[PDB]
């Protein structure tokens, strides 16, 4: 579709558990390594080319950032590239870690 949607972390977690959507994290690499959601792919302009080759445009994509702000612009960017089902995760990593502290991974 031609718009992206904002979702909360409980919704995102459920989609992930059901294997319905993939999760990308657009934060800087240092913050990513300090802690990220399990199964998050670190998506940057450099890793985008690989991401696109590896995830067809019909793949639902959920975008996480620091707080839920930059993920909106990144989600819109992905729609513009051809993705049809894109979400921005309200609250970002802060919300993820608060709700799901046992589902945090470290490093790359």
From Swiss-Prot:
Any one GO biological process: glycerol metabolic process
EC number: 2.8.1.1
Top-level taxonomic group: Bacteria
Catalytic function, reaction form: thiosulfate + hydrogen cyanide = thiocyanate + sulfite + 2 H(+); thiosulfate + [thioredoxin]-dithiol = [thioredoxin]-disulfide + hydrogen sulfide + sulfite + 2 H(+)
Subcellular location: Cytoplasm
Keyword field contains Cytoplasm: yes
Activity regulation (UniProt): Incubation with the cysteine-specific modifying reagent DTNB resulted in a greater-than-90% loss of activity. Does not exhibit anion-specific inhibition.
A GO CC term attached to the entry: cytoplasm
Keyword Transferase: yes
Record-level Gene Ontology MF annotations: thiosulfate-cyanide sulfurtransferase activity
CDD domains associated with the record: GlpE_ST
UniProt-annotated catalytic positions: 65
Keywords per UniProt: Cytoplasm, Transferase
Transmembrane segment boundaries: none
Rhodanese domain boundaries: 17-105
Disulfide bond entries: none
Deleted gene: phenotype: The deletion mutant displays no apparent growth phenotypes. The mutant is capable of growth on glucose, glycerol or acetate minimal media without supplementation. Deletion of the gene decreases total rhodanese activity by about 10%.
Pfam families named among the record's database cross-references: Rhodanese (PF00581)
Gene3D superfamilies, per the entry: Rhodanese-like domain
Record's miscellaneous remark: Overexpression of GlpE can complement the growth-defective phenotype of the thiosulfate-grown cysM deletion mutant.
UniProt-listed HAMAP family: Thiosulf_sulfurtr
Complex formation: Homodimer. Monomeric in the crystal structure.
UniProt-recorded name of the protein: Thiosulfate sulfurtransferase GlpE
Species of origin: Escherichia coli (strain K12)
């Amino acid at each position: 579709m031609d718009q992206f949607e904002c979702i909360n972390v409980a919704d995102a977690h459920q989609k992930l558990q059901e294997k319905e959507a993939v999760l990308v994290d657009i934060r800087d690499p240092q913050s990513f390594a300090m802690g990220h959601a399990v199964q998050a792919f670190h998506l940057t302009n450099d890793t985008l080319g690989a991401f696109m080759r590896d995830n067809d445009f019909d793949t639902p994509v959920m975008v996480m950032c620091y707080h839920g702000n930059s993920s909106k612009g990144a989600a819109q960017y992905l729609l513009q590239q051809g993705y049809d089902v894109v979400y921005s995760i309200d609250g970002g990593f802060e919300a993820w870690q608060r709700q799901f502290p046992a589902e945090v991974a470290y490093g790359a």
